[PDB]
Structure formats: C-alpha cells, structure tokens
C-alpha cells in the first residue's frame, strides 16, 4: 500500500468461454467491446 493501491492486491477474474477459436481480428473486436463494457461499470478502475 505504500506504492500500489489497495485494489491491486485483490483483483477479480472473469472468463468468457466459447466453442470456436477466438484468435482472429473479428473476435478481437468483440473482446475489446466486452473489455470496454466491463471498464465502464461504476467503481472499476481498469481492466487488462
């Protein structure tokens, strides 16, 4: 806590599971959309 913030020591984890491979740009667009949606929730600092 002298350097970081308190929230970085207890992070959350979310997983989205599909049935097809997601390593293409078309799915990366949807992944970025989900990341922005999660970040816009009130009380969330950052999503990586």
């Amino acid at each position: 806590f002298r350097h970081f913030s308190q929230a970085k020591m207890n992070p959350d984890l979310m997983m989205v599971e599909t049935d097809r491979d997601l390593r293409n740009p078309a799915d990366f667009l949807v992944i970025d959309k989900i990341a922005k949606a999660l970040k816009n929730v009130h009380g969330i600092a950052q999503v990586q």
């Binding site: 984890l13 740009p25 667009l29 922005k36 990586q48």
Partner: protein, 49 residues
C-alpha cells in the same frame, strides 16, 4: 491526429491487423490471456478503493 489520439488514450475505436497476430509479442500475449485451444479468454478486473 495520430499523435493526439495516442496521447489522449482514446479508445472509441479498435482494430488489430492480421499481421500483428504473428509478432512474438502477441504470440506470447495469447498464451497469457487465452486458452491453449483458443476457445476462452480471461479478464482481470481491478476495483476503486
């Protein structure tokens, strides 16, 4: 315009070209955030306060 959109950390739009998927940096990244068969992706969420 490019410098301004980079400095402001704007995120209204996003696109990653197919060529970037072959670089070593994203080859390592996809083994850090996606499953070995590529069917799932994990997000890390950090609160405020």
């Amino acid at each position: 315009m490019s410098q301004a959109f980079d400095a402001a950390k704007n995120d209204d739009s996003f696109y990653l070209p197919p060529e970037a998927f072959e670089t070593d940096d994203f080859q390592r990244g996809m083994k850090l955030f996606m499953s070995p068969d590529g069917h799932a992706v994990r997000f890390t969420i950090i609160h405020q306060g």
